[PDB]
Each structure stands twice: as structure tokens, then as C-alpha cells.
């Protein structure tokens, strides 16, 4: 295991299992299936693949070119997500929509999406966004807004850096004999505030029960003692002075007008020092509060 | 050998107390909290969180300083452990 | 009134008795076309249920009808039949001989 | 019996016999039978199986996929219950309802319930909940409210943890030659407040008789003496000090302004100490009351 | 109102006897109690009788199903004996 | 409100015993705790029990899924034992 | 507002250790830091950590792309360790 | 004297740079700044801001560390100031 570290070795091992994300994915898959039935007048089946928590560069490197990349806003979460519409899926959708029964072999040679193809992508994307919002509403209500569309992964740059860890969710859609894929790409920073909710789903009766749980939590943790350490003074010395140091040595010190009270190093308050009852006491002037 | 200089940070602690979150959040302006250290008891001296000595506040020509009452010993480390 | 293929897609997941109930109500050509699209087992089951139909409850039929109305509430289907055969051929009739012979050769291959 | 304990060994042995739950089950079974006769215009017979007090994960592992899982509210009890409608039962119900005489073999291959099938499930569930409320009203009146329906056991997660102990009640319904099952799944936490009532039913004349029993109970237990121990002071020592401790040693103690009076350790009141009649006495300032 | 635990006890029966047979007691010595076989055993709270109930065995554990709560008349009837 | 770290701990169970067996202890000596196998382990905050939760193993690591927060009645019920 | 230059530095990680291994150090002695491989390195201004960013190599030169600016909570979380 | 159990702080600096307020403010999200040290140079092992050792970077079971190649000499200490 003794190997020289080198840059660009993004050995980012962040392993989790977002059961709530999985359930949202399944609900959105059902909603998208019914929406696709409504639009295409044909019944698809959507298979939700494994969730890939992978670096953004690795995710993008596997994306076929050209492809549809739709930027979306996950309000109120800071940042943007992506919807990946594959050329095969868009081809099949347009073929079904515009008179083709889809029996013809799919010929994807690689080309940009025309304005008509763009509008078809817009419609399917609107349906997908509505279904995804509906799926998420069961856990956390949010507003999803279309931003714009792109053809190349370099156009998007969804993360600050390509090595940033991102979540991808694939869906394989089958209609008759025609297969396609579409993906949902959300940066891990999007869900980091809600990581606790996404890991475990095991709550269903929680609207005021969450408030009751939190109130119980605070009122029960309010009976836990702490470790107040008040650093009276601070002298900088050298190790030679430490080694030669002998009892009875007096160490000069700047006069501490304010004593900082901290726990485990963590500043708690600012106070003045004094003596009462024969013991050292602190009269608090200001608690440490940003 | 080469470690003769090694800038070190020495701190003295005024006292410690056993107190909980309720009163902790109920501290107000001008409120006084006592510490387990008796007045006149030499204060502790710490380096990176460990015992290094016990020293007492002494008036030295209008300049308060700390005079080392004693150096720590392994026995006392274990006793205060 | 709508396309038998999309109808088969819609009704394939429905209960076989529900399939029989729906197929009863439609014009016979539409029902036959839809049945031509289902696989052998489901088609046979639905045909046997059609033969052995015993009678749907009125409230059940009303609920089925309102469900279908909600599902088909999408504004208009009207798949425009305009164009196809007898268009392609007369188009090819206008081609250069080489172009149209390559065209018909490709069509024969396909 | 000396074996190393390992996690996920949920050897949860909580054995009881809820006779009142059994009687409620039988009454609900009769009500559901008459309701099924009213709806299907055919006479079923419902057999109430043994009550399985089993872990939630074990209960779910035996549930066929897909199946109807109906979340219900057992007001005013905190939490939610479940009604399990089997695919065979729903198939038979729809077949009978929509013209099929049921003579055809039941072909359950595994598929989701359509909207019409959802309506049929909704009707049978409404009848079931009404019958269950009627059955319960005899013992304790409850309000039952439909929440939603699911196809997968992962969609529900009725308990906080899969190892949570839950109550399941199966019912086998036969109509002619067609057999089906349906289950009632209530978490043991639902009935823990009413465990005493559910264990034994042996009371029928109890509306004001319960109040009379309780009044007699309190007025008769008010004659029982207790063991008031007032801890005057609290000194922390070490075992070396205890071993070397000799008579005449004085132990420093912080001054107790308030004396806690407790019984078997259970704090009863806060008081001041004094002397009257030549005996130690306590003047009570505040009883221990949350 | 209060959350105090109590030591509940169940008493099989009573016995009024002089210490003749007490000193004559040995392993195997027959003793007879005041209560005949069949009547409810007595439920006492901190040694204070409040109830009467029948004895049952559940999961090979002794238990008592409380049949009734006592009245002052029956209470003192028991006492004056 | 405050951002203080705390040492949360999980306790498997209790044991009330005199030091007979304590001095008799050796490698291999069997000890029995107050808690039976199956009940939630106790979540303590700075040694203050606040919760009960079930033990799980994740990624070959001990973890506890908190099942419920305790109540004062159950708290003192545990204490008075 | 001001046009002052500052010595900005990048720190790979931290290490809390007593001088046992310090005096035992030699060419080839293995040392382990607090930070695991992968997390952003720390951007310090005159020794004041203000940012975190990922390490890159450009034109065979070390560089850091600043990923984020730190918050007081994460700052003191780092400090109290 | 062997008062030597004291713990000390060890840091590793990937690189340093001098740069002004304007460039600081102009740095934005994702901005990358090149370091003065050329790639592959041994990093600086500091103790409380004091340098004694130089060494290259290495990863030891996903854990950061340095392979030290020069530790003790003050001969170039005049240069790095």
C-alpha cells in the first residue's frame, strides 16, 4: 500500500445507499411512463437502473455524442441538475410522434436536434419534470424549472470541477422493440443538505411528528453536562525553554482582560474573571455566537 | 537535538466546571459562573491539551505573571487522570 | 374511433374480464384488430371470456366508463392519415430513371 | 447456550394472546362477509387464521409481489396500519364484478392494478374499513381513514425498523371454488397502549362500572405505606478511601440547601430539613411532579 | 398522579396458631391455613390488602387474575378472626 | 443554537453486582448484564441517556438506528433498578 | 481597497503526534497525516485557512483549483481535533 | 531533561505563492492558481510553522504522508526567509 501519490488520482470513495432517492426514482419512473403513454399514445416500460455515485468526468465520459442535456433548477437547493435525453430515445419519440410506427431500424448517425426535435424534447422534458416534482413532493416539495439545453458535455460543466462527485440515475425505456435510455444527473452537493433524508425512508407519519421528535430531542439533550475550560492566559515559548524550565520560574504574560470559555477547544463565551465563595468564577459578558 | 527550538504553545486554564445545556443556554448578561478552582489554588498549565505544570499568579512589578509552583510528575498525571 | 394499436397498448395491462368488457362495446372491426395485436394466450383468454360473458354490474360499468373518459380526456387523437402509399409511388414516377430504379430496388430489398 | 451474539439476530420473543383482538377479528370477518355478499352478490366465507406476532421484515418477506397495500389511520392511536389485498382476491373480485362468473382458472402472472382495478380495490377497502370500525366499536371506538395504496412492501415501510415487532391477521376467503387471502397488519406499537384491553375480553357490563372499579382501586390503594428515604448529602469517594476509611474521619460535603425525598430511589419531593419534637423533620417545598 | 413503584404481594391464606406447633415444626410437618381451597387469594399493596383474585398459571409462571376489589365490611370481617 | 461537540456513547446494558465476582473475574469468566438480548441499546449524551435504538452493522462497522426517544417515566423506571 | 501582497499557502493536511516518532524520524520513516487522500487541500492566507480546493498539475507545476470557501462551522470543526 | 511526552503539531505544505489583494478578489469559483514549487519537488514538513524536513508526497492506504529526504540542516535557512 506504499505507493507514491500522484495528482488526478480521484480515489473518491464515498459509499452510501439513498433509499429515498431510489423511491423517488421509482415514483418518477411511473409518472414518466404514464406521461409517455399520454403523449405517444403507446405504453412504454421504464426500468430504473442502479444509482451511480460517480465523478462528473467519469459520468460525462460515458455520455454518447451528440445528446440532449437539459439544465434544471432544484429550488430552493442551491445549484442546478441535468436531464440527459439520449439520441435513440429522441429518435424513437419523434418517429412515433410524426407518423412513423417505429418498425423501421433506428439509424442514429450523430447529428444535432432540429427545432422540431427541440420542441419534442421540450415536451418530453416538461412531462419528466412534472413527474419528477410529483415523485419528490412525497418526501420534499420543490420547484423544478427548465434552464436551457445543450448538445455537448462541455457546454454544461455541471460541477465546479470534473472530479466532483455526482449522482446519476439511468432509466431504460422500451416501447415494443425500440429501446432507449434517459438519465438524471444531480450533483452530490445538491443532496448533501438532505443526505440524511435520502439515506433512509423509514417514516410515513411525519408532519407534526417530526416537530414532536425534534422537541423531545432538544428537551432530552438539555440534560447533558459539558466541559468548560477557561484559558486564563497564553504564553508562547520554545522547546529549549520548556526543557530547561524549572519550578519557581515566572513567565511574562500579557494581561488577559477577557477570558474565553471553551469546550473541547470550542469557544463558548467571553467573560471576566473573579473570586466568589473562595473559588474562581466567571461573569459572562458575551456568549460565542456568530 | 535539532528540536531545541520547536515553537510551542503554552496555555493555562482558569478552572473547570460540571454544567449542562439548560443553564448553558440560560447564561445571560452579567451572569456569574463559578469554577472548581479555589481562589489561591495554583492554576493548571497545559500544552496541546496535556499537563505540563501548575503555576500561580504572582505580582511582578505591576506585571502579573505565572510562577511555576511545581513541575508535573507521572504519578500526578495518573492521579489527575 | 382511435387506432387499434394504441388501443391494444392501453388495454394489454387491463384485467382480462375488463378487456372483454371493453371489446364488447366497440365496433367489431376495432375489436378484431385489437385482438390481432395481443399475444396468443391473452387473446385466447379474452375470447373465451367474451364467449362466457355473464354480465357486468352497472356501477362497475359506470366506474370503468368514467376511468376511460378521464384517461382519454386528452384533447383529440385524430391521427392524420394524409399521405403514404399512392403518394410515394407517384413521387417515384417523377424521378430520373436511375434514381427511381435504385429506389425500387431498395424497396424490394426492404 | 454459550454462543457469541451477532447483530441482526432479532430473537424477539414477545409472546401474548390477544383474545380481544381475536374477537374484533371475528366480528370484522362477519361484517366483511356480509359486505362482500352485498357487493359481489355472492356469498363468501371468511376464515380468520392465527394471529402472527412477527417482525415486520419477516411479515413482508412472505408477501407476494405485486400486492395491494393500503395505509390506514387508527385514530386516535399514533401511527398507521395496513390492509393487504392479495392479487388472487382482487382478481376474483374484479372477475365476479365485471361479468366473469369465476369458473375460469385464475391466472395471476404479476402485474400492477389498473385504475378500474384500483376503484374495485377502493370499494372493497371501504367496506373492509367500515366493518373493522364496526367490530372495534364494541371494545374501543376508533376512526379509520384511508391514506394511500402501494404495490411494493418497500413503498410502505410500516415500522421504524424492519425488525420491529408487528401484528398480522390473515383471512382466507372462499367463494365457490375461488380462494383468496387478505391480511390486516398493525404494528405492535399501535396496540401497546391498549395491550391490557386486547389480552383479555372478560368484561361486558363496563361503561360506568369501569369508573366505579377505578375509584374503588384508588380509594383502596390510598391505604398503602411507603418508604421515604431523604438523602441528606452526597459525597463522591474512591475505593482506596473506602478501604482505608476509619471512624472519626470527617468527609467534606457541599451544603445541601434542599433535601430530596425519594422512595426506592424514586424522587418524591424537595424539602428543607430541620428538627421538631427532637426528631429530624422535612418541610416540603415542592413535590416531584413533571 | 404519582409514579411510585410498590411491592405488590399475593397471600395464600392466614393461620392463627400458638408457637406449640411452631417449635414442633420440621420438614414434612403438616400445616393448615385459615383459607379453604378455592377462595380467591388476597392481593396486598405494600402489605395492605386491597383485592381478591384467582390463581392461574401462565407460561409456567404464577399469576393472579383479580376477581374483585374488597369492601370495608368484608375487610374487617377478615380482620376480626 | 450552539455548535458544541459532544461525546455520544451507546451502552449495551447494565449490571448490578457486588465485587465478589469482580475480584473473581478472569479471562473467560462469564458475566450477565441486566438487559436481555433484543431490547434497544441505550444512547447516552455525555453519559446522559436520551434514546433507545437497535444495533446494526454497516460496512463492517457498528452503528445504531435510533428507534425512539425515552420518556421520564421509562427513564426513572430504568434508574430505580 | 488596499494593494498589499500576501503569502498565500496551500496545506496538504494536519498531524497530531507526540515527539516520540519525531525523534524516531529518519529518511524513509513513514508518516501519516490527518487528511485522507481525496479531500481538498487547505488554502491559507498568511497562514489563515480560508478555502478548500483540489490539487492539479499544470505545465508540470503544482496548482490548486479552489472548490469552495470555508464556513465558521467547518472551520472550528477542523480546529477542534 | 526528558520532559518529552509532549504532543506536537505537524503540517505539510504543498506549495507557497505571493499574490496581491486584487488577484485574491479576482479569484472566483473554480479558479486555479499555480504554485511556486515545480511539480515533483519535496514538500515542506512544518512544526508549528517551523521547517525542519523536506519530503515528497506519498499515499499510504489512502492516507496522506510524506517521504522525507532532508531533515536537520540550517545551511539554507538563510535562503528560505
Short mmCIF file of C-alpha atoms in Angstrom, two decimals, chain E residues 16 18 21 32 43 70:
data_model
loop_
_atom_site.label_atom_id
_atom_site.label_comp_id
_atom_site.label_asym_id
_atom_site.label_seq_id
_atom_site.Cartn_x
_atom_site.Cartn_y
_atom_site.Cartn_z
CA UNK E 16 -53.78 -18.26 63.81
CA UNK E 18 -49.68 -20.69 69.09
CA UNK E 21 -46.64 -26.33 66.61
CA UNK E 32 -53.32 -25.89 57.79
CA UNK E 43 -53.88 -9.05 46.79
CA UNK E 70 -62.64 -5.74 48.63
#
